[PDB]
Amino acid sequence: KLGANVGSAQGPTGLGKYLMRSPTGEIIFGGETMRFWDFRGPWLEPLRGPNGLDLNKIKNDIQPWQERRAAEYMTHAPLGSLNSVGGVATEINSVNFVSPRSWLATSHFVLAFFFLVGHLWHAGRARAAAAGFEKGIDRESEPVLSMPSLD
Amino acid sequence: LVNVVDEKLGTAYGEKIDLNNTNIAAFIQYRGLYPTLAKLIVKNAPYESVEDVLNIPGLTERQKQILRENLEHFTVTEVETALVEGGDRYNNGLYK
Amino acid sequence: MEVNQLGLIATALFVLVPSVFLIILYVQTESQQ
Amino acid sequence: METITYVFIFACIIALFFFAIFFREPPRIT
Amino acid sequence: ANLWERFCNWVTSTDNRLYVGWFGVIMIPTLLAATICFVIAFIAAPPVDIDGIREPVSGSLLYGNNIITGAVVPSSNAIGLHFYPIWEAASLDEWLYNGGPYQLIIFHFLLGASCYMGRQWELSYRLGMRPWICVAYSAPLASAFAVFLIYPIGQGSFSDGMPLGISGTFNFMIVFQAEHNILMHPFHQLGVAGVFGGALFCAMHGSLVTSSLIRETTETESANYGYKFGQEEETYNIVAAHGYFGRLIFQYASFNNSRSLHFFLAAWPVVGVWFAALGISTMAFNLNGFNFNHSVIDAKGNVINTWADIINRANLGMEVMHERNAHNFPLDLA
Amino acid sequence: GLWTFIALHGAFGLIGFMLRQFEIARLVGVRPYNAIAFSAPIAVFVSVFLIYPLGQSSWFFAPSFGVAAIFRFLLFFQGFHNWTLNPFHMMGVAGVLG
Amino acid sequence: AWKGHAVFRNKEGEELFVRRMPAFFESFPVILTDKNGVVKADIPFRRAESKYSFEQQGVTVSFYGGELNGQTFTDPPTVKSYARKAIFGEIFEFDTETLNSDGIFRTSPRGWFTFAHAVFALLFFFGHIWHGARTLFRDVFSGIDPELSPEQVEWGFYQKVGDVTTR
Amino acid sequence: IFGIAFSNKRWLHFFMLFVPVTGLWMSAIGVVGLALNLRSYDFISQEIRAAEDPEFETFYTKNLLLNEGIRAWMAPQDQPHENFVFPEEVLPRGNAL
Amino acid sequence: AELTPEVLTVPLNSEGKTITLTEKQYLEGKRLFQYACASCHVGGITKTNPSLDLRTETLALATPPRDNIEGLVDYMKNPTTYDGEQEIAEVHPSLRSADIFPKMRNLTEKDLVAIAGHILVEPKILGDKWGGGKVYY
Amino acid sequence: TLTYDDIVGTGLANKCPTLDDTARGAYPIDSSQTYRIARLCLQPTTFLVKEEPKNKRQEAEFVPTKLVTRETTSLDQIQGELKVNSDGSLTFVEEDGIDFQPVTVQMAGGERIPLLFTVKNLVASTQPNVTSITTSTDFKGEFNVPSYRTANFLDPKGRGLASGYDSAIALPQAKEEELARANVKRFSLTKGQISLNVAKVDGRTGEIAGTFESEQLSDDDMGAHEPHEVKIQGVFYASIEPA
Ligand code: CLA
Ligand code: CLA
Ligand code: CLA
Numbered sequence A: 001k002l003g004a005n006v007g008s009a010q011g012p013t014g015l016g017k018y019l020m021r022s023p024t025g026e027i028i029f030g031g032e033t034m035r036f037w038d039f040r041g042p043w044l045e046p047l048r049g050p051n052g053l054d055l056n057k058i059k060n061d062i063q064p065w066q067e068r069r070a071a072e073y074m075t076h077a078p079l080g081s082l083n084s085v086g087g088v089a090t091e092i093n094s095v096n097f098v099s100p101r102s103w104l105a106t107s108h109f110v111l112a113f114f115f116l117v118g119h120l121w122h123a124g125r126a127r128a129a130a131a132g133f134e135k136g137i138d139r140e141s142e143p144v145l146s147m148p149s150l151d
Numbered sequence B: 001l002v003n004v005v006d007e008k009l010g011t012a013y014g015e016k017i018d019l020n021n022t023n024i025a026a027f028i029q030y031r032g033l034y035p036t037l038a039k040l041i042v043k044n045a046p047y048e049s050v051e052d053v054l055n056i057p058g059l060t061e062r063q064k065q066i067l068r069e070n071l072e073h074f075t076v077t078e079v080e081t082a083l084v085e086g087g088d089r090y091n092n093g094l095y096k
Numbered sequence C: 001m002e003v004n005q006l007g008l009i010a011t012a013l014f015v016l017v018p019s020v021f022l023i024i025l026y027v028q029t030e031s032q033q
Numbered sequence D: 001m002e003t004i005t006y007v008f009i010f011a012c013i014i015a016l017f018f019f020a021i022f023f024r025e026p027p028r029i030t
Numbered sequence E: 001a002n003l004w005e006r007f008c009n010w011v012t013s014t015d016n017r018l019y020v021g022w023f024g025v026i027m028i029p030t031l032l033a034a035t036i037c038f039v040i041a042f043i044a045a046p047p048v049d050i051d052g053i054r055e056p057v058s059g060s061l062l063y064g065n066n067i068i069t070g071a072v073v074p075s076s077n078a079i080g081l082h083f084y085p086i087w088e089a090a091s092l093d094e095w096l097y098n099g100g101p102y103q104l105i106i107f108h109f110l111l112g113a114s115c116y117m118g119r120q121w122e123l124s125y126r127l128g129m130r131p132w133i134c135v136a137y138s139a140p141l142a143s144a145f146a147v148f149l150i151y152p153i154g155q156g157s158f159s160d161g162m163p164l165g166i167s168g169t170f171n172f173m174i175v176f177q178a179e180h181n182i183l184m185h186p187f188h189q190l191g192v193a194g195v196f197g198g199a200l201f202c203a204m205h206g207s208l209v210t211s212s213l214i215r216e217t218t219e220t221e222s223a224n225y226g227y228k229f230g231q232e233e234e235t236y237n238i239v240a241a242h243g244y245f246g247r248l249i250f251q252y253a254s255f256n257n258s259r260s261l262h263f264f265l266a267a268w269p270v271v272g273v274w275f276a277a278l279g280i281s282t283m284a285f286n287l288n289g290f291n292f293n294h295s296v297i298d299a300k301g302n303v304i305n306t307w308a309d310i311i312n313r314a315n316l317g318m319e320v321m322h323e324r325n326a327h328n329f330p331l332d333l334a
Numbered sequence F: 001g002l003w004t005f006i007a008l009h010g011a012f013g014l015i016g017f018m019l020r021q022f023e024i025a026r027l028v029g030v031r032p033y034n035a036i037a038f039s040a041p042i043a044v045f046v047s048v049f050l051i052y053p054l055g056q057s058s059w060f061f062a063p064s065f066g067v068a069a070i071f072r073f074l075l076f077f078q079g080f081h082n083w084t085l086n087p088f089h090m091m092g093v094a095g096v097l098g
Numbered sequence G: 001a002w003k004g005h006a007v008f009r010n011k012e013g014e015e016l017f018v019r020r021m022p023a024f025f026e027s028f029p030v031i032l033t034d035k036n037g038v039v040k041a042d043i044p045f046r047r048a049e050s051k052y053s054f055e056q057q058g059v060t061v062s063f064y065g066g067e068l069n070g071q072t073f074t075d076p077p078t079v080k081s082y083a084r085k086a087i088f089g090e091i092f093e094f095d096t097e098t099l100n101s102d103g104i105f106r107t108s109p110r111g112w113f114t115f116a117h118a119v120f121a122l123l124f125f126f127g128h129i130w131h132g133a134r135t136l137f138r139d140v141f142s143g144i145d146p147e148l149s150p151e152q153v154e155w156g157f158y159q160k161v162g163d164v165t166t167r
Numbered sequence H: 001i002f003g004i005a006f007s008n009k010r011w012l013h014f015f016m017l018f019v020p021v022t023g024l025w026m027s028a029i030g031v032v033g034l035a036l037n038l039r040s041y042d043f044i045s046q047e048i049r050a051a052e053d054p055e056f057e058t059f060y061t062k063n064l065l066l067n068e069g070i071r072a073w074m075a076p077q078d079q080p081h082e083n084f085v086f087p088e089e090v091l092p093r094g095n096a097l
Numbered sequence I: 001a002e003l004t005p006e007v008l009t010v011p012l013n014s015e016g017k018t019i020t021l022t023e024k025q026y027l028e029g030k031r032l033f034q035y036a037c038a039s040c041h042v043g044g045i046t047k048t049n050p051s052l053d054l055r056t057e058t059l060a061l062a063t064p065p066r067d068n069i070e071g072l073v074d075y076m077k078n079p080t081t082y083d084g085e086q087e088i089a090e091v092h093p094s095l096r097s098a099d100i101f102p103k104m105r106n107l108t109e110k111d112l113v114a115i116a117g118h119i120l121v122e123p124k125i126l127g128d129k130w131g132g133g134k135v136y137y
Numbered sequence J: 001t002l003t004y005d006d007i008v009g010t011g012l013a014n015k016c017p018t019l020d021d022t023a024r025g026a027y028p029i030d031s032s033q034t035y036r037i038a039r040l041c042l043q044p045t046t047f048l049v050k051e052e053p054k055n056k057r058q059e060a061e062f063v064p065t066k067l068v069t070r071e072t073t074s075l076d077q078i079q080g081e082l083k084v085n086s087d088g089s090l091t092f093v094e095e096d097g098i099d100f101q102p103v104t105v106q107m108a109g110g111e112r113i114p115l116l117f118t119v120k121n122l123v124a125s126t127q128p129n130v131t132s133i134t135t136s137t138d139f140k141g142e143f144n145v146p147s148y149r150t151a152n153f154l155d156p157k158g159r160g161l162a163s164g165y166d167s168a169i170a171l172p173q174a175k176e177e178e179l180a181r182a183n184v185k186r187f188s189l190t191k192g193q194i195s196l197n198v199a200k201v202d203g204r205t206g207e208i209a210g211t212f213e214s215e216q217l218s219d220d221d222m223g224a225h226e227p228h229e230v231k232i233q234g235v236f237y238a239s240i241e242p243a
């Protein structure tokens, strides 16, 4: 809007400040978000052409609802503190926000992990109990004593 | 061996809005310039002299008044490649 | 790289003097009946 | 020289692993 | 005895100097791949464009690193979470520029170490042991997953995986503090209680057992010769150690039961490190440490700084300097 | 004043605790390895809370007694001392994690 | 040789003073204030919103005493060189060739003496603990009494701990 | 499982005493060094190379940039008695951030 | 220091008339500001366009001037670009665009005044912190 | 007609359109009409770096290199005015487009050569009296090659041009003169030449394609070292349309 030709704007690194190529050539957003070019969303796809982000569509066809949606989503990034201070870790208190996505992902990663542990616990124990040594080694029948030494 | 940006700080560029080099955000410093005139001004750079800014095609009378009112805040110096490449006049990597 | 050249000998001795110490102690332990 | 030193020390450690594992004092039950 | 049966018997044999087992069948080649690639890369790999901005970082010894600064450098930010095996590269030179060795090493390693856990269960079963040593090992393992895999997944790039190097590790920690304020996260704090506490109980137990060694030796010989491998009788007096420690604190803060004591010794650091791993794994999804920035305000509304605010100043230093050429837009959203 | 109060009474308190380890060990008849092991926390406390600021300009740069205050101490040691690069710290980390 | 005392002035002729480097800092920004401590010039990191650059403020340096006595420099790069040195205090000419000096500060014998002796003092504390323990516990150095009665270490048996005459 | 094992219980428990105790003592020595700012701050060879060669980058130089950030951004509030006034323009910052 | 009537006295209009807010008004303004604005304007900056902040000096140099209650209330009804040249209701929350910015729906005139009041008072309290960004955190 | 989902991940996104081999036609130029290049696409296929002799009196040659920064090399969506000159020649003036790509190629021995492959501000003209673009038309022109890094770029010790330290802060009392070249960043702006050989013309659609050769300098790392001469060969596509 300020008059930049975003297609030809060279960033400090030499990669495009706004637009660059993915490792397979698709036109993608620049800066760190180069990692996120696999992202697909209803607000972004109208700017997409066969080769990725289309510079003519970018120049001519960006609608206000897209600007709105991008502003909203950018300012509701799933970053926030445990006491629900929204934003990067260095942000000041003001916005009471943690994304539902962070809550759901973290909760279920924790649960999934502990359930993997419960699986190890109970599978190992079930094996031991079925074989008959979950309460410990029989002193009079210690298997290792019947085994040849390793050296 | 000279840092040309530091050097330019020793010119009028370090005092006023250089129509040929200064990043567009600077135009926020004075009433009426940002974003419309600022865009027109950066787009039609470079300028041989400050009052050339009044010759931009399409300017309304209002816009010319605003410009005339701000000519003292403007300067021109030689275009510095380091300052104008990279689209840096539109976004020079500085935010807050 | 402009490393400090004494580093080499400093490292060598650092490894060798105590290692040798241990080796002596060990070998004369093995040779005891 | 530094590189040679670093890699040498490292190589000695791997050799030491070998001897410590395969040429250890056998644990003997008593 | 047919060939498959013979092979299975050898694989699961309790007579092999190193137990192989079925988990070992996966473990050995993957760990060997990870190890060989790691050694070769640590010594000789050319610089890697970790942050995808055509700014290669030198990790190997031959390219100007010592043991402390050296690293296998994470794969490029341009790759993100894309799978980058050697055969996806046009050449080895490309693969190396973009940090392929990192992916090869951490995938082979994570597989290998998972199988190492499985193998601990497995040998325990062949030997007629109880099964849960592997559960203790799940804590450092989960930690390795957290920093090599989960955190990249959440942040969308292996370029944010922990580097395979000492100084790289420090880099990862500092940036993590900037972006998640991990110090202020209770899971990291529980982690610190886990390892501080584990160290403490390690010295504690060590010192108490050592303090109550039954006299079996003369002063000119190592007390260690007073224990003989496989002897049936205990080598220290747990009743004396208990009398001592019980009087050190009070009687009911001391363990008289060796089983419950040793269980405690297992549980404390394992649970603690589980929380540490969960900290990294949940901050992977940007649920970050406590934020009390400008929490204390005076009657007028002046910010009254607390130590949290000083911490925030340090964090800001880290944030603004890290990856100094990689950001074009004002917020670092991953 | 409370900072020196706590640091000093704390120092002598630690001395007292180790003396207690020796005393009870001696009464009960065990070897004093618990006390000996406790020499390490005392070395840490004395070096971090006393010697370190005594080398610096003032007590100000000692650690403050608080959770976040200690976190600040950590971050300060990274930024000013590059303490993670220190092989003595590294040995400490090996000791604690090991 | 002493180069002489650097006196920095701005275009208005105010004397400016370089903020000296605190011992804590491996590196330190170059900041010049007036006598009242107000920032009047500096060496900017980001140039694009710089207000206090030597070039904007017309900073000069004049030397009094030492080898540069009577001289005044006005070109920004030179002035900035001297300001950089000025954060270290008085400015000296050094021979860096003879020893192939690397430009990085080293501590004095005061530093090394202090370090060595604080460290040895601290380690010898451990020596004291170890040998004191050995002295006072000589009887149990190789281990505790095989016949240590459980009731000597269990509670209440003796009124006084470790005193069998108090059962 | 691991190739080597304890076979001596006394040595095992002594070792459990030895490891963390020794670690803490070592860290203590390092901090005694930091009392005098006798730091392990730099690798001189790295700095010489990096000073001369602007394409040379390691995790060590990266971390120094982080430290410089920490110092500049935290010093004025962390050391109020010094009265550090650091104008925005002198604060070290990468692009955008 | 405290939140005095002096602090709570702000320009009502460009003519120099002033209005004195209540403490309740100011706090309401803070709450409403957090509710409808702070996601972009936390601390008086602008996350989606950092060039324009909410410092009173910036507001004063806007067209038409926004460094007073009427200017800010008008802005929340019908926002313009900084030079007044364009109406930006379609991309900036406003009463005019309460259909596409639904949080603006439950805002009343009274509320707009409170929010305005907060925006004008806060820099009198926080000084450089207001609109200063991370440098002053 | 392919879509983004057909193409994504294939490498096709970095390739220029080709024309059928039937396209040996002729696209008529009406010297009274103004034309436009609606899309100019340059796909490099080879990167050659001029070797640098020791005796300096022999001949320097261009050696082949290995591309290590993947399918991120093509210039595309370049547009600009196509003017008919007094003498019947056509001049393309580049207005805008994705007209640069950082490229790193590697030489035998492992030396990496970064360059800003670009046609920024390309002005290119044909032979005089072009009544029709044909397979014998060719464009020759000049373009700007700005510094590979722009002014904000910070080197690993945090030195830069528009930002950063102005000294080697890790060597506080080193003699500065020896470090001048590394401490003082310089922004180069050089020129490059390019030839476009038109090999295919669809006169019906105004589409042309062919091969190109461009020459330019590589990265000088902001004045820290000498750049290399780079020769770039490839194919190009352009669609002409009346404006
Ligand atoms: C699927 C699990 C899940 C998820 C993702 C959420 C998510 C949310 N809840 Mg809900 N909730 C849940 C289950 C969940 N909840 C349960 C079980 C209850 C009954 C207690 C509630 C009752 C509830 C109320 C009353 C409220 C919420 C609210 C919220 C929101 C704010 C959360 C917050 O601030 O927490 C604070 C964060 C914590 C308290 C962290 C807790 C850390 C725990 C204790 C660690 C435990 C780990 C593990 C289980 C222990 C292992 C031990 C080991 C030895 C094995 C957030 C969207 C709030 C809201 O905004 O509503 C609109 C709100 O007011 N929740
Ligand atoms: C234990 C043996 C083993 C295993 C599991 C792996 C695993 C891997 N190798 Mg390694 N490798 C090995 C030995 C092994 N390697 C050896 C001996 C060599 C020397 C020749 C190598 C040399 C090598 C190179 C040079 C590379 C790899 C790479 C890889 C990764 C990708 C492999 C792939 O795409 O296969 C595809 C998977 C299959 C063909 C098998 C799937 C078949 C099943 C039946 C169907 C799917 C079901 C699914 C797998 C679930 C199974 C669950 C199970 C419990 C039943 C993966 C981590 C690549 C890498 O690291 O990328 C970064 C890579 O570049 N390997
Ligand atoms: C892998 C992570 C890791 C690990 C394992 C360590 C480990 C360590 N760090 Mg390091 N650290 C790290 C990363 C790590 N660090 C990083 C990334 C940084 C940033 C540079 C630091 C910065 C740092 C600093 C600044 C310091 C350490 C120190 C240490 C050592 C502390 C030992 C200790 O327990 O003191 C704990 C304290 C004591 C043992 C003193 C005695 C405590 C008494 C007995 C408590 C009794 C209280 C009583 C019971 C009442 C309780 C009251 C209750 C209500 C609270 C230990 C070696 C310290 C050190 O080296 O000391 C020499 C130190 O000063 N670290």
Ligand SMILES: C=Cc1c(C)c2cc3nc(c4c5[nH]c(cc6nc(cc1[nH]2)C(C)=C6CC)c(C)c5C(=O)[C@@H]4C(=O)OC)[C@@H](CCC(=O)OC/C=C(\C)CCC[C@H](C)CCC[C@H](C)CCCC(C)C)[C@@H]3C
Pocket (backbone or CB within 6 Å): E196, E199, E200, E201, E203, E204, E207, E248, F006, F007, F009, F010, F011, F012, F013, F014, F017, F034, F037, F038, F040, F041, F045, F064, F065, F066, F067, F070, F096, H020, H021, H024
């Ligand atoms: C921060 C980590 C940490 C804490 C909190 C800690 C705490 C303790 N260690 C003790 C023991 C030990 N620790 C040991 C090895 C270790 N200890 C370690 C690390 C710690 N040890 C590590 C890493 C090791 C490995 C070598 C051993 C071998 C022992 C014991 O034998 C002994 C024990 O009994 O354990 C069961 C107990 C000493 C009781 C006492 O002196 O009462 C007297 C109380 C006094 C003298 C007050 C001290 C005052 C302190 C020094 C300053 C004031 C502190 C404030 C009150 C609180 C500040 C809190 C903020 C910083 C957040 C106590 C539970």
Ligand SMILES: CCCCCCCCCCCCCCCC(=O)OC[C@H](CO[C@@H]1O[C@H](CS(=O)(=O)O)[C@@H](O)[C@H](O)[C@H]1O)OC(=O)CCCCCCCCCCCCCCC
Pocket (backbone or CB within 6 Å): D017, E010, E016, E017, E018, E019, E020, E028, E031, E032, E035, E036
């Ligand atoms: C760059 C490419 C590099 C390629 C390298 C490929 C190497 C392949 C050649 C291998 C030649 C033999 C080497 C092994 C010798 C041996 O182990 O014998 C020791 C015993 C003896 O074997 C025993 O051998 C006995 C026969 S005899 O006594 O040896 O004659 C037999 O009876 C018994 O069943 C059997 O177990 O072997 C075993 O215990 C079973 C197999 C153990 C294998 C363990 C592999 C562990 C690898 C870990 C990976 C990570 C390592 C990282 C570094 C720490």
Ligand SMILES: CCCCCCCCCCCCCCCC(=O)OC[C@H](CO[C@@H]1O[C@H](CS(=O)(=O)O)[C@@H](O)[C@H](O)[C@H]1O)OC(=O)CCCCCCCCCCCCCCC
Pocket (backbone or CB within 6 Å): E190, E191, E193, E194, E197, E257, E259, E260, E261, E263, E264, E267, E268, E271, E272
């Ligand atoms: C309002 C709140 C509502 C409720 C909320 C609930 C919150 C969670 C409550 C948790 C309660 C857990 C009970 C577990 C009992 C148990 O494990 O018994 C197992 C043994 C048996 O005890 C032994 O008991 C034995 C008899 S028997 O086995 O119990 O039958 C006996 O032989 C032996 O001498 C004796 O020591 O108990 C122990 O020996 C362990 C003692 C210490 C407990 C350690 C727990 C795990 C370690 C802590 C984790 C780390 C945390 C911090 C990390 C940094």
Ligand SMILES: CCCCCCCCCCCCCCCC(=O)OC[C@H](COP(=O)(O)OC[C@@H](O)CO)OC(=O)CCCCCCCCCCCCCCC
Pocket (backbone or CB within 6 Å): D010, D013, D016, D017, D020, D021, D024, E018, E224, H001, H002, H003, H004, H005, H006, H007, H008, H009, H011, H012, H015
């Ligand atoms: C599938 C294979 C997976 C494992 C393969 C790799 C295993 C390597 C194991 C280490 C072998 C070397 C042990 C020598 C020493 C040795 O042989 O010890 C053997 C010793 C046996 O103890 P005993 O109780 O039998 O000894 C009692 C008396 O000898 C006391 O005098 O074991 C220990 O003391 C355990 C504690 C030390 C264990 C230290 C492990 C350290 C890990 C390695 C850290 C360095 C790595 C640096 C990398 C650069």
Ligand code: HEC
Pocket (backbone or CB within 6 Å): A071, A072, A075, I033, I036, I037, I038, I039, I040, I041, I046, I048, I049, I052, I053, I054, I055, I058, I059, I062, I066, I072, I075, I076, I080, I081, I082, I088, I092, I093, I115
């Ligand atoms: C993000 C989506 C925003 C929210 C939510 C709100 N504002 Fe905003 N504001 C935003 C932008 C991008 C801009 C710049 C607009 C432009 O191009 O000129 C603004 C601007 C303002 C201003 C003018 C600032 C000035 O002149 O210096 C004001 C006074 C303002 N915004 C106030 C405001 C209020 C009161 C809000 C909540 C009701 C609010 N804004 C929400 C972005 C966003």
Ligand SMILES: CCCCCCCS[C@@H]1O[C@H](CO)[C@@H](O)[C@H](O)[C@H]1O
Pocket (backbone or CB within 6 Å): G077, G078, G081, G082, G085, G091, G092, G093, G094, G095, G096, J172, J173, J174, J175, J176
């Ligand atoms: C362009 C430089 C002009 C001013 C001279 C630099 C300040 S003084 C300079 O500083 C050096 C340390 O860097 C010393 O080695 C040397 O002796 C001294 O002349």
Ligand code: OEX
Pocket (backbone or CB within 6 Å): A032, E051, E077, E155, E159, E160, E175, E179, E322, E323, E326, E332, E333, E334
């Ligand atoms: O990559 Mn490694 O670090 Ca996770 O934030 Mn964003 O990205 Mn980068 O910046 Mn900060």
Ligand SMILES: [Cl-]
Pocket (backbone or CB within 6 Å): A030, A031, A032, A033, E326, E327, E328, E329
């Ligand atoms: Cl970015």
